[PDB]
Amino acid sequence: AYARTLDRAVEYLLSCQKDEGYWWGPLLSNVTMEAEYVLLCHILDRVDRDRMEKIRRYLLHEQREDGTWALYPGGPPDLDTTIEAYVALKYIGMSRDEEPMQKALRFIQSQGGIESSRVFTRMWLALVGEYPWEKVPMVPPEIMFLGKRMPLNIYEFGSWARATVVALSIVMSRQPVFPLPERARVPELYETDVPPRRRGAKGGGGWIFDALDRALHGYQKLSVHPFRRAAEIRALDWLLERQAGDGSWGGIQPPWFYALIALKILDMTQHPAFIKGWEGLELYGVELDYGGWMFQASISPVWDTGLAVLALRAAGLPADHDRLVKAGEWLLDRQITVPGDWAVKRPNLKPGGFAFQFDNVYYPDVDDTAVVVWALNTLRLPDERRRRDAMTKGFRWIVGMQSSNGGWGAYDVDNTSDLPNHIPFCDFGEVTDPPSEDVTAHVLECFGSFGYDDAWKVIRRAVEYLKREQKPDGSWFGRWGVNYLYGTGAVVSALKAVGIDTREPYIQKALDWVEQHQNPDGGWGEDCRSYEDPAYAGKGASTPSQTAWALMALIAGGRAESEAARRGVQYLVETQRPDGGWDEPYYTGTGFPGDFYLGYTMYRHVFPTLALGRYKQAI
Amino acid sequence: AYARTLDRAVEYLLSCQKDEGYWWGPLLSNVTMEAEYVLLCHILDRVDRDRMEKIRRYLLHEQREDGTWALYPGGPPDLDTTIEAYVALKYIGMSRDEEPMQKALRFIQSQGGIESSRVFTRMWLALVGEYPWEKVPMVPPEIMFLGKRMPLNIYEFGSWARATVVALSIVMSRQPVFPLPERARVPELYETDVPPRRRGAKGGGGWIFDALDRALHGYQKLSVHPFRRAAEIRALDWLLERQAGDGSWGGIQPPWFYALIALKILDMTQHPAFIKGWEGLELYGVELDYGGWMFQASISPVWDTGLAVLALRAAGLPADHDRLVKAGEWLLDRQITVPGDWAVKRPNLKPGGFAFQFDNVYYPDVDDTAVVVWALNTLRLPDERRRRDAMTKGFRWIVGMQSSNGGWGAYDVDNTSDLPNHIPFCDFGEVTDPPSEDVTAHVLECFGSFGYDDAWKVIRRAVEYLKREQKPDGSWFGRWGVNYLYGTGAVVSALKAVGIDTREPYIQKALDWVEQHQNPDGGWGEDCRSYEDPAYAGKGASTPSQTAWALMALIAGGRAESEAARRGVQYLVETQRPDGGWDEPYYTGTGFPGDFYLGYTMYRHVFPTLALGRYKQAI
Numbered sequence A, B: 001a002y003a004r005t006l007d008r009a010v011e012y013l014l015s016c017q018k019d020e021g022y023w024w025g026p027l028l029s030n031v032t033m034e035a036e037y038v039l040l041c042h043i044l045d046r047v048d049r050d051r052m053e054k055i056r057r058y059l060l061h062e063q064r065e066d067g068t069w070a071l072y073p074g075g076p077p078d079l080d081t082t083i084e085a086y087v088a089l090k091y092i093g094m095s096r097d098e099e100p101m102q103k104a105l106r107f108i109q110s111q112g113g114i115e116s117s118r119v120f121t122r123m124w125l126a127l128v129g130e131y132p133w134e135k136v137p138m139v140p141p142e143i144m145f146l147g148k149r150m151p152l153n154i155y156e157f158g159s160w161a162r163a164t165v166v167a168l169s170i171v172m173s174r175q176p177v178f179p180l181p182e183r184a185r186v187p188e189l190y191e192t193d194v195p196p197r198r199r200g201a202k203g204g205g206g207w208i209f210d211a212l213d214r215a216l217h218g219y220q221k222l223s224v225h226p227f228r229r230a231a232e233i234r235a236l237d238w239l240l241e242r243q244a245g246d247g248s249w250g251g252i253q254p255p256w257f258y259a260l261i262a263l264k265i266l267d268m269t270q271h272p273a274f275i276k277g278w279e280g281l282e283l284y285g286v287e288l289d290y291g292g293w294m295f296q297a298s299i300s301p302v303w304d305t306g307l308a309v310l311a312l313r314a315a316g317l318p319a320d321h322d323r324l325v326k327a328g329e330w331l332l333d334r335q336i337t338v339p340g341d342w343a344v345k346r347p348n349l350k351p352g353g354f355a356f357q358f359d360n361v362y363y364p365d366v367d368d369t370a371v372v373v374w375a376l377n378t379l380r381l382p383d384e385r386r387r388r389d390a391m392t393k394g395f396r397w398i399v400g401m402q403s404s405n406g407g408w409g410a411y412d413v414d415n416t417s418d419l420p421n422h423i424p425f426c427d428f429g430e431v432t433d434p435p436s437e438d439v440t441a442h443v444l445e446c447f448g449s450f451g452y453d454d455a456w457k458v459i460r461r462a463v464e465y466l467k468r469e470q471k472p473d474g475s476w477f478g479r480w481g482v483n484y485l486y487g488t489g490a491v492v493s494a495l496k497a498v499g500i501d502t503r504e505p506y507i508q509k510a511l512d513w514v515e516q517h518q519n520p521d522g523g524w525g526e527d528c529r530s531y532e533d534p535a536y537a538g539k540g541a542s543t544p545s546q547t548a549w550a551l552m553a554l555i556a557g558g559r560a561e562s563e564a565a566r567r568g569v570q571y572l573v574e575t576q577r578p579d580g581g582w583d584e585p586y587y588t589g590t591g592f593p594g595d596f597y598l599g600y601t602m603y604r605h606v607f608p609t610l611a612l613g614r615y616k617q618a619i
């Protein structure tokens, strides 16, 4: 039955593999990436008419009937995302009259206008002079002076926020303005009667910070700020030191863009770092067949390769398959062997983790490291020495990264300060990197592949963490994947792997929860709205990936020979395309709960294959 | 008569011009460049068999009958240069037996062996483990803490020395050792009875520094050096900030190589600065027609283009010659507009100088700036706006650079501290950048082209400087060119240009001195020995360049219609080749008096053309 499904899925995956031996699906987000790029180009005075065109096609193509843009496909209109697209288009050439611009304008106005947008949006506009800098939360270069153990020092922030802060402190220090031509001025963004509904700091704003901001904005106005020249250089140097190999910073869009703007402010356009930073951009861009062009928020080569391998193995291919070896070798060359920012909390920990993108040595993450090390543990490579060695280095690094509560974060250890969540500036997504259930799960499943069971203290401290986090309905939150189906699947699968008993109550309470959300069509689906409204937990159109996740939770919990189980397998079998792949018009990936969503192009092919491979194992 | 000579010279130069519109002759030095490169490759574990080959042919080809190598062609054997070439060859494959190895070895031993070599040589060997680090003058990272105005702070050193110091402080801080394979160990460098004759600090060693060093080497042996981590990062950052656009550092061999070694020490081989730094090297290499390969100590594109233009103009071509325009435009795009290290002494001075090499924004020099601004002042470019503007910016930058004594230095203002000349480490070439007669001359000649005569206070302060520097026999030292003929020619030519009276006594006392050295063959020549032994001042085989220099001094001083004058013109007319150029088997360029000499490939063609162009003007 499914065998033909599985067989076609395999050969399909194998066809996507690149020559070098890795997999790499494009990462999907939203138009703010491309829109901000257009503005970045204006700032850097490097506008390519041809590119602007491909960018306009993409922007329009993404706009919906109502004239808005959302974070995820089929999501509510987003003000920020729409404002930035509006300005972007207007700059490229669209007149405020044209149908598309008209519809957008309405929605923006009906929302309170520009005054209701997140800090970033108002800041970008501030950069081109369409909004007063005085009204933008201030972040001073001086933050660079705070010591390792002090409130708000830059190591209290999550890796992704950190670099962005450092880069912006230089920008906000000089508060530069790169004027748009009259043709693109967007005053109309203010023309609204609706009361401005401003978003506040992620965790509530204490009058202290509010005060501190006003203070900083006044200090900004002074004629002489002592030790600021130093403060700036401290930031610039912090940047120059960490620049990624591909010319980016952290391998993510934000800091990268701001870092380039910072170097531009400092007349360093003829510096190696800026040049490399600029041309490195092209690697993230993507030519769309319909004439458009998009920019990836980040890239997932290592991640894709890691899961690809685990899926093809669980699916059947030999641990020494010559095609899976191309991958295994490639992964060994990726391992990071130098201290990253994580070392600030673990100076005696030996390097050995892996990153998400291609070349990002200073920021490996526990998730990639766990999946990559685990994947390697399922292969038989020519040089058994390097495989044995690589796994051990990574394995040890993972252990040494375990946080206090017994779970694992992504990039740091105990990055749990609650302090930064109240600053005015921080009103978008996560700003700290605390332990999460999904990462912790992947780690346990990784250790489980080696054997290490509930006997080892590390495993127990973690399982304790998971048990305490389990939700009332027996489900588990999904931090980096949408959502409860993603988390529950991860945990149950992991717990099964570390020896724990699948018969326990909490495991059953979970398994039941999964069967209880199986859509009519046999599959499972969870809409990104489940982060905003609990009524959507486990609800949503069925997707290949999410179906596969709920399916793994069941297979793992013993209910592989169930109705719900066989039903779900049927779904994947029927919905499969002729080439062997699957389709998935919805996002199943999470960047920041309720704020930033991602589309993992490979998920739709890899997880169904993995789930089917594990089902075939159950018989 | 000469018209045919000049006509041929012109078409020849015009044929050497590159497409972009600039001239660029290879810069010649000595085998330490290539020899050190071989070792650099060993350190960085990046050895290319094919390249080592081309390097061996070059090394051998340069060795002389006696089996030694010199700084300049036809110079005495040099111990340092010979020791490094010896080790280099041995590493590439030569056995200590072979003829070349045998002769070299002897000369080395008859000199006291490895213990008589300069610091650098013993350091390089120290780097590969063929010499104890303990015996190498120590330079600590901590030097990074000294403030702007303090003894031995890094801004008291000359630009070329500064970067080298910073880079090495990181190296010497870790004192790394990259072992050579047994096959290449060079113990035989010690096997000598001759007493080791060690070279001391450029200006004499006070027992203080001698003690201080011993102190540092002791402090080096301790188990904990507080704030050293910080000292290092201060150096690393200092470097990262200043890296040149081509990936070099200063556009010179030394710091560039050491900076790469430093980054290697700090596990930063995957960092952008290193990559760019490594691949930028190829631009300086040169394929030799006989199968060899040499590395340029530095490159002179701007410099060559600058003189090339001035010569072709003084020769006759129109100020709007479409070919000289390609050059004029090219030169405008080179002007530096950002603060360099010079700004540390002139914060309110607006950028506008030019550099020697292609892309080196942080280190413009008064010499290039003067010759380039002057050369532009002799052209008629399409955009008379940018020409007018550029000249102004450069002009002003020159003025603001003028030192205290009224003369100009190369890279800095009043870089005259006598302190650094006594440190143990500093036993090779110049370490400070004080004002010099030749640069000062070129500056005055520049201003002169505009008009600014002896009326202007600036000019006078300088002329006073020159008058006070003139030597007893009426000659002027040659800092960046060999030698008294170089300086005297410069000065007298300049003085003539700033209105001064050529009839004055000191001018005549100079003019006579010139005539008094005209070799029998009608030309002039000065051997590089004139820096070591005063018996050679104005003495040496005749060369096209030096002949043209003495010839300019005469033409400038009114004695254009003289015997010596017409005699010299004859020389150039005859010695000229059929293609139009000239030959010059001798070095007429100076890096560091008595320590480092250079061969300016274009000098032989450009100066004779310029001299003949100015002679044609005298009639």
Ligand SMILES: C=CCN(C[C@H]1C[C@@H]1COc1ccc(C(=O)c2ccc(Br)cc2)cc1)C1CC1
Residues within 6 Å of the ligand: A160, A161, A164, A252, A253, A254, A297, A298, A303, A356, A365, A366, A367, A368, A410, A411, A428, A429, A430, A480, A591, A596
């Ligand atoms: C499934 C695997 C999970 N791994 C992949 C992770 C790397 C992907 C998240 O990547 C991004 C990309 C862009 C942003 C921002 O826009 C942003 C917006 C605002 C600020 Br302030 C900063 C950045 C954010 C994150 C991680 C656990 C290891």
Ligand SMILES: C=CCN(C[C@H]1C[C@@H]1COc1ccc(C(=O)c2ccc(Br)cc2)cc1)C1CC1
Residues within 6 Å of the ligand: B160, B161, B164, B252, B253, B254, B297, B298, B303, B356, B365, B366, B367, B368, B410, B411, B428, B429, B480, B481, B591, B596
């Ligand atoms: C005629 C024009 C005059 N200009 C040409 C200048 C650029 C040429 C000198 O360039 C070099 C090249 C190599 C070295 C060292 O090897 C060195 C050895 C030991 C140490 Br310590 C440091 C460097 C040094 C200098 C200057 C006045 C503007």
Ligand SMILES: CCCCCCCCOCCOCCOCCOCCO
Residues within 6 Å of the ligand: A241, A242, A339, A340, A341, A342, A343, A344, A362, B229, B232, B233, B236, B266, B268
């Ligand atoms: C530059 C001094 C070399 C000593 C520093 C190496 C050890 C520092 O521990 C790591 C601290 O966390 C920051 C890491 O990001 C690395 C880039 O900085 C460059 C290498 O020092």
Ligand SMILES: CCCCCCCCOCCOCCOCCOCCO
Residues within 6 Å of the ligand: A229, A232, A233, A236, A266, A268, B241, B242, B339, B340, B341, B343, B344, B362
């Ligand atoms: C990064 C703070 C901005 C202050 C820089 C203004 C320039 C101050 O003059 C310092 C002169 O030293 C030469 C430095 O240029 C090299 C790169 O440093 C980066 C920005 O100047």
